[PDB]
Write a protein that binds this DNA or RNA. Structure first.
Ligand SMILES: Nc1ncnc2c1ncn2[C@@H]1O[C@H](COP(=O)(O)CP(=O)(O)OP(=O)(O)O)[C@@H](O)[C@H]1O
Lengths: 56, 49
DNA sequence: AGTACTTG
RNA sequence: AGGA
DNA sequence: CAAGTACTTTTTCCGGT
């Protein structure tokens, strides 16, 4: 569909970063993070991306 | 008055089981919510829905 | 315990 | 690990 | 091409490793 779903959009170019409500930090005590799994996997993506960028 | 029936009466060994009502009874009407889903928490202990 | 699927 |  | 393979929805709702 030329408006809502073109084939080119099955390939990811720019990635949507969901907000905290989706990946809340289970913040124990006052001085302790407790980040979500999604928050860690997103940082992995970032790191993997930064390397590739500088590398090229 | 005498019962028209005769009852099968005699001692029998009975065990007391771990399931007691007051340890099972639960009611909730607004209370803790989960964080992600923002829905009621789970469990009598946690005062869930 | 079955079904389309998958891999030899 | 238990409950109907 | 077929055998043997993985997955899957595989009943519901109620103490704490
Ligand atoms: N795993 C399960 N899932 C859902 N329902 C269950 C269940 N196990 C038991 N039940 C429910 O509990 C009822 C009672 O089963 P049981 O506690 O074993 C006594 P019974 O088999 O009905 O014989 P009885 O009335 O002559 O004593 C069932 O008919 C069923 O509705």
């Amino acid at each position: 569909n030329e408006v809502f779903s073109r084939p080119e959009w099955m390939i990811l170019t720019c990635l949507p970063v969901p907000p905290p409500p989706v990946r809340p930090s289970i913040s124990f005590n006052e001085s302790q993070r407790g980040e979500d799994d999604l928050t860690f996997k997103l940082a992995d993506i970032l790191k993997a991306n930064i390397s590739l960028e500088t590398l090229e | 008055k005498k019962l028209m029936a005769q009852i099968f009466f005699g001692p029998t060994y009975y065990q007391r089981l771990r399931h007691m009502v007051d340890d099972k009874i639960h009611a909730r009407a607004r209370g803790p919510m989960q964080v992600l889903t923002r829905q009621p928490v789970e469990g009598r202990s946690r005062d869930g829905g």
